[PDB]
From Swiss-Prot:
GO biological process terms, semicolon-separated: cell-cell signaling; fibroblast growth factor receptor signaling pathway; neurogenesis; positive regulation of cell population proliferation; positive regulation of cold-induced thermogenesis; positive regulation of D-glucose import; positive regulation of ERK1 and ERK2 cascade; positive regulation of MAPK cascade
Cell location: Secreted
Main localization (coarse): secreted
Record keywords: Growth factor, Secreted, Signal
Protein name from the UniProt record: Fibroblast growth factor 21
GO CC list: cytoplasm; extracellular region; extracellular space
Keyword Chloroplast recorded: no
Taxonomy, superkingdom: Eukaryota
GO MF, any single term: fibroblast growth factor receptor binding
Portion held of the full protein: 42 to 169 of 209
Quaternary state and interactors: Interacts (via C-terminus) with KLB; this interaction is direct. Interacts with FGFR4.
């Protein structure tokens, strides 16, 4: 079970049903329904650290220092690695261990202001 295939879906989408989707252009965001690009290969690097590679785009989902998500052709553990936080409540979350940057979908910066504080999006992986 070194690597598993699962779809990333969060309860935040409850307001607007959507699943994490990776664009071929390397961009990221939600989708109307479960799209092929929503399928991410969950790979385990080191105990507590994992990697995610989209099957459709064959791009490695990595977060930039700014905290934005984007697919990349090359592998970078400093940004393509995340710490898995498993809650007894049955919720799973991902965060970058490099700088402690939280994982979140892009476009969330709709407000004019940009507060430093930011809560991570709870994700519920679904069987691939």
């Amino acid at each position: 079970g070194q690597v598993r295939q699962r779809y990333l879906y969060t309860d935040d989408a409850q307001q607007t049903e959507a699943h994490l989707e990776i664009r071929e252009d390397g961009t990221v965001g939600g989708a109307a329904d479960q799209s092929p690009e929503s399928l991410l290969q969950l790979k385990a690097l080191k105990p507590g650290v994992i990697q995610i590679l989209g099957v459709k785009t064959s791009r490695f989902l990595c977060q930039r220092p700014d905290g934005a998500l984007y697919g990349s052709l090359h592998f970078d553990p400093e940004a393509c690695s995340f710490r898995e936080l498993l809650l007894e409540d049955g919720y799973n979350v991902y965060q970058s261990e490099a700088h402690g940057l939280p994982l979140h979908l892009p476009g969330n910066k709709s407000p004019h202001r940009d507060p430093a504080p930011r809560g991570p999006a709870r994700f519920l992986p679904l069987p691939g």
